[PDB]
Amino acid sequence: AGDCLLSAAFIAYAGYFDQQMRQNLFTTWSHHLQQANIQFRTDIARTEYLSNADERLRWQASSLPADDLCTENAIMLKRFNRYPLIIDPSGQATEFIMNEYKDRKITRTSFLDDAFRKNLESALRFGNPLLVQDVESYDPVLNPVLNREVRRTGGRVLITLGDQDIDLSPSFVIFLSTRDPTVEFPPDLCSRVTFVNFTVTRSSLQSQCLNEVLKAERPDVDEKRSDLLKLQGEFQLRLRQLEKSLLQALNEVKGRILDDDTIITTLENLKREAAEVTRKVEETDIVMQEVETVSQQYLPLSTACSSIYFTMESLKQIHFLYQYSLQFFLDIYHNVLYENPNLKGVTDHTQRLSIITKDLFQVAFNRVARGMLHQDHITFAMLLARIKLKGTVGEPTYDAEFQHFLRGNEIVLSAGSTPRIQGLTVEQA
Amino acid sequence: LKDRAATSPALFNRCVLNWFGDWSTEALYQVGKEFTSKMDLEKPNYIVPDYMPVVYDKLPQPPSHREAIVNSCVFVHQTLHQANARLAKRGGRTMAITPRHYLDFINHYANLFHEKRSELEEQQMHLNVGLRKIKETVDQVEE
Amino acid sequence: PGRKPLSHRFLRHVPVVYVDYPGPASLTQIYGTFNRAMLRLIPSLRTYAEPLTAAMVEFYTMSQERFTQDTQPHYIYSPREMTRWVRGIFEALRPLETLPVEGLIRIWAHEALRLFQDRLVEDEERRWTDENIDTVALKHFPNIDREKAMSRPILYSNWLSKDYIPVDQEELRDYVKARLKVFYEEELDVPLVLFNEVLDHVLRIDRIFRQPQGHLLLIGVSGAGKTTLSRFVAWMNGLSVYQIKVHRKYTGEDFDEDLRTVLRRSGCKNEKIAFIMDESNVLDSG
Ligand SMILES: Nc1ncnc2c1ncn2[C@@H]1O[C@H](COP(=O)(O)OP(=O)(O)O)[C@@H](O)[C@H]1O
Numbered sequence: 001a002g003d004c005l006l007s008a009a010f011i012a013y014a015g016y017f018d019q020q021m022r023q024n025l026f027t028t029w030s031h032h033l034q035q036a037n038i039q040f041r042t043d044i045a046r047t048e049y050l051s052n053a054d055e056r057l058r059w060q061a062s063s064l065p066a067d068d069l070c071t072e073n074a075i076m077l078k079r080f081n082r083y084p085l086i087i088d089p090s091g092q093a094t095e096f097i098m099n100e101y102k103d104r105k106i107t108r109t110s111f112l113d114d115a116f117r118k119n120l121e122s123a124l125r126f127g128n129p130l131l132v133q134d135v136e137s138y139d140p141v142l143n144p145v146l147n148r149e150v151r152r153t154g155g156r157v158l159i160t161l162g163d164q165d166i167d168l169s170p171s172f173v174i175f176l177s178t179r180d181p182t183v184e185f186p187p188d189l190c191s192r193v194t195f196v197n198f199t200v201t202r203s204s205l206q207s208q209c210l211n212e213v214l215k216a217e218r219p220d221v222d223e224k225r226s227d228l229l230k231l232q233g234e235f236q237l238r239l240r241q242l243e244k245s246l247l248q249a250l251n252e253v254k255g256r257i258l259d260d261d262t263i264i265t266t267l268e269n270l271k272r273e274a275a276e277v278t279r280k281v282e283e284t285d286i287v288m289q290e291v292e293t294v295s296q297q298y299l300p301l302s303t304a305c306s307s308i309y310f311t312m313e314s315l316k317q318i319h320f321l322y323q324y325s326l327q328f329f330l331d332i333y334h335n336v337l338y339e340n341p342n343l344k345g346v347t348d349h350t351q352r353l354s355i356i357t358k359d360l361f362q363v364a365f366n367r368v369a370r371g372m373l374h375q376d377h378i379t380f381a382m383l384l385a386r387i388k389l390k391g392t393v394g395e396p397t398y399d400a401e402f403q404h405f406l407r408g409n410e411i412v413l414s415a416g417s418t419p420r421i422q423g424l425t426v427e428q429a
Numbered sequence: 430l431k432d433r434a435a436t437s438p439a440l441f442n443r444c445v446l447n448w449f450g451d452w453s454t455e456a457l458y459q460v461g462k463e464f465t466s467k468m469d470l471e472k473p474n475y476i477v478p479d480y481m482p483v484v485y486d487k488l489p490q491p492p493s494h495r496e497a498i499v500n501s502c503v504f505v506h507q508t509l510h511q512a513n514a515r516l517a518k519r520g521g522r523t524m525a526i527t528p529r530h531y532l533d534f535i536n537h538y539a540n541l542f543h544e545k546r547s548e549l550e551e552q553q554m555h556l557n558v559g560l561r562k563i564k565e566t567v568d569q570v571e572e
Numbered sequence: 573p574g575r576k577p578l579s580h581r582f583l584r585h586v587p588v589v590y591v592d593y594p595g596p597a598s599l600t601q602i603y604g605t606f607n608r609a610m611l612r613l614i615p616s617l618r619t620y621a622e623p624l625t626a627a628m629v630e631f632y633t634m635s636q637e638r639f640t641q642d643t644q645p646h647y648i649y650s651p652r653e654m655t656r657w658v659r660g661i662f663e664a665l666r667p668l669e670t671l672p673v674e675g676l677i678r679i680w681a682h683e684a685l686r687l688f689q690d691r692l693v694e695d696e697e698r699r700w701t702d703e704n705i706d707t708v709a710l711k712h713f714p715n716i717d718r719e720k721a722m723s724r725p726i727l728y729s730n731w732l733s734k735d736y737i738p739v740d741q742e743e744l745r746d747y748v749k750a751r752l753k754v755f756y757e758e759e760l761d762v763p764l765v766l767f768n769e770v771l772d773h774v775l776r777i778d779r780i781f782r783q784p785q786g787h788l789l790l791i792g793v794s795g796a797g798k799t800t801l802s803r804f805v806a807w808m809n810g811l812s813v814y815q816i817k818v819h820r821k822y823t824g825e826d827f828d829e830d831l832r833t834v835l836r837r838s839g840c841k842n843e844k845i846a847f848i849m850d851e852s853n854v855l856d857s858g
Pocket residue numbers: 460762763764765766767770792793794795796797798799800801
């Protein structure tokens with residue numbers, strides 16, 4: 001009861017918020033439910049409760065990033081009542097949904113197209129998906145479609161799309177998308193669509209980078225995290241598959257006793273896999289106790305990565321030419337991970353993390369500054385130094401000192417400004 | 430409305446404006462209670478140690494966990510309203526949340542609850558069928 | 573806003589007269605005559621015409637002093653509100669006789685809430701209006717029974733009886749469910765739960781539809797039910813709802829033709845039209 005409550009509250013309400021806000025919403029709802037003793041199971045995974053193995057696998061096959069935000073967006077996209085409105089500055093979501101609907105012949109159309117109505121009426125009759133981009137100029141003829149106000153009272157299900165009436169095919173699904181990362185929408189359109197937001201955020205970078213470094217460094221914790229996820233149902237799914245295989249074998253052999261090994265092998269395999277699942281469940285206390293330690297060990301690297309990328313993104317303000325995309329930072333990160341010349345020999349993890357962090361800082365500075373004027377190298381270099389200083393823990397953040405260094409000399413006062421020693425001037429005083 | 434009046438002065442001359450407020454906690458509680466009725470949320474074993482109402486007025490007595498479910502749904506709506514307010518206060522680009530969001534949330538809850546009860550019931554009956562088959566195999570072995 | 577200052581070249585040829593809001597004494601003299609003329613259907617309450625006008629003017633001025641246009645752009649309080657107040661009270665006394673003072677001040681309070689509170693935005697404003705309508709009622713009528721207000725849901729409807737008798741919450745709710753059964757049978761099988769605000773809004777839209785010049789400005793969040801309630805109460809009063817099907821290529825002459833069609837239906841064939849529009853329906857200032 002409470003578990004589906006949380007899942008549906010996440011699906012219908014969240015979707016426009018970023019990963020941090022989605023998680024804050026979910027943890028607040030979970031705290032409220034547990035405080036009222038609405039029994040919901042802890043250590044929940046939204047992704048695998050709202051999807052199974054084959055759906056996720058086909059999603060990854062059809063060009064879906066491995067990030068959890070993309071998986072939750074795909075979950076919101078498979079099951080929805082209000083037709084989704086996609087927010088993605090880049091195009092992975094649009095190509096994802098084009099791939100997910102090749103077999104149903106999804107038509108690509110835009111509101112700016114003069115043939116939008118012609119492409120929409122034919123799509124709605126034929127019953128094939130239609131994906132419409134550039135929702136900035138949303139066309140008000142879709143209001144009956146988004147409202148689902150089709151009149152079923154008549155013999156055939158006719159929708160009053162415009163002046164004339166068109167029969168609504170049951171397989172018609174419309175998709176809306178935009179190319180702009182963030183823009184205001186009219187509330188009337190807002191109430192008729194499920195905002196699914198692929199826009200990337202500091203928390204999204206932190207999660208992506210943490211996942212990537214955990215896959216690269218210490219693959220064992222990543223594989224046992226995957227196993228922890230598989231503990232929610234899909235291992236039980238394979239359990240049920242072996243159960244039905246045993247049931248088929250039982251009446252395939254008709255209870256043969258002369259050759260019993262045919263069923264003894266299956267029974268032994270079932271016993272072994274049951275023991276394995278029991279061991280995994282009983283280790284759920286030991287795991288997520290060292291997994292959390294490992295994840296927190298790799299957290300400074302991820303927060304440094306997010307800070308570095310968003311400093312690069314904000315470098316637009318310094319100069320118009322300083323234009324860097326997310327793919328450029330992803331290339332920098334993949335370079336510091338999978339082809340470092342400094343990581344060939346060192347195998348200890350605590351030293352490997354230091355090398356990765358240091359070289360990530362260095363490669364970011366090199367790649368960014370190579371396309372910067374020789375008056376901003378110090379600016380980027382010392383912004384990176386500030387990021388590293390917040391990264392390290394041996395010394396304080398020195399927030400007050402930086403704030404003074406930046407803007408505290410603008411404090412207005414005229415008391416005691418007279419120089420006292422002969423070796424001093426008024427501005428120095 | 431400021432420039433809607435300027436474009437057409439007759440909007441405040443011949444039209445008696447009726448302001449619709451956002452659905453109050455009572456309205457949300459009533460919608461949730463009525464729509465989550467086909468759902469079977471009746472749990473005989475349920476204990477309430479604390480006091481966390483949102484509706485505050487009707488049926489504050491120890492609930493049957495159905496009042497608790499609807500109370501939690503209304504709290505979800507209120508919490509998203511607080512989330513929007515905090516996001517606007519500490520930044521910008523917030524989005525209006527309508528009663529249609531509440532209706533969509535209740536529909537999602539109903540459908541997901543139905544699916545996740547039906548799948549468990551069907552796997553349980555499959556398990557019982559397998560148990561009966563194993564008993565039949567035991568009978569064959571005894572023979 | 574929207575008032576462009578006139579050019580001095582034209583302004584010198586036209587003298588201008590400043591017509592301000594009538595003062596409390598002028599308002600009292602204006603509407604005391606109206607109250608005395610209205611109360612001729614009930615000789616039993618002639619002595620209460622003076623305090624009725626006193627309370628009307630005092631409440632109107634009190635709501636004029638605060639809750640001005642600074643907070644919201646639609647907080648316009650004019651003697652037109654007083655005129656509508658008098659017209660509503662008079663229409664609520666046309667078929668009705670032998671009314672006690674409690675019933676008269678009940679009608680007064682109902683009209684004051686309909687013309688003074690349903691416009692307010694915040695709940696604090698609404699409860700301020702309720703508290704001060706109660707306090708002015710008790711100040712200008714210190715010798716009345718709690719029949720004046722009883723439960724705060726002051727409702728008037730002409731559905732249960734021929735006249736415009738006040739109705740109870742539960743009976744009206746049951747009647748609205750009964751009519752919603754047939755409404756669903758006709759169309760919109762979607763369920764509509766009837767909470768207090770829904771009944772209040774339905775009654776307000778009905779009383780607007782009663783008058784010949786009834787025009788509405790239903791302002792509220794999307795999905796609050798403004799359109800559904802509008803069509804429901806339009807059917808419940810036998811008005812044919814007409815909507816504009818708006819798209820991008822929907823031009824000005826299309827709107828002109830739609831206006832021509834709706835006016836032909838309204839005038840010719842004597843068909844009552846509940847023609848409704850939304851903000852998404854408007855794309856041109858024309
Ligand atoms: N009192 C109510 N109970 C249940 N549902 C309602 C209620 N009022 C409105 N709705 C729902 O709102 C939807 C349409 O809302 P609408 O009338 O378009 O609001 P608005 O006109 O303010 O956008 C309908 O599908 C209906 O189910």
